[PDB]
């Protein structure tokens, strides 16, 4: 039987906060140092030189993977 009619209180208080980072926030990426390329030399069958900026080059990279390439002041 029913004796009464009432209004339904509830305590919805969130007072605690637990947020956990999903895994992919910590995954790696590939980051690189970046300087302005002053020049480039490519050689595979035939050598080719491109010069963007002529200055005394303070750093030089050599990379052999497919074609021989030399990145000047890179």
């Amino acid at each position: 039987m029913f004796l009464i009619h009432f209004v339904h209180y509830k305590t919805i208080l969130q007072k605690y906060t637990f947020k956990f980072k999903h895994i992919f926030l910590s995954i790696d990426k590939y980051n690189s140092l970046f300087f302005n390329i002053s020049g480039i030399l490519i050689w595979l069958n035939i050598i080719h030189i491109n010069i963007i900026l002529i200055k005394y080059s303070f750093f030089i990279l050599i990379n052999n993977f497919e074609y021989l390439i030399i990145l000047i002041s890179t």
Binding site: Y30, I37, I40, I49, I51, F65
Partner: protein
């Protein structure tokens, strides 16, 4: 892939245009170094220094 590392991160500079100022370009008989800077070696040691 293990190779996914060796991709280019940035777009590499295109070759749009002609050989640079005082480039080595070789006529009928010319002894040409790609290596030696044409303009900065010709410039007197007296001035530029050793």
């Amino acid at each position: 892939y293990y190779w996914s590392r060796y991709r280019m991160p940035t777009q590499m500079p295109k070759f749009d245009g002609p050989a640079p100022v005082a480039a080595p370009q070789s006529m009928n008989s010319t002894k040409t170094n790609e290596f030696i800077d044409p303009i900065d070696d010709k410039f007197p040691m007296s001035i530029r220094g050793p």
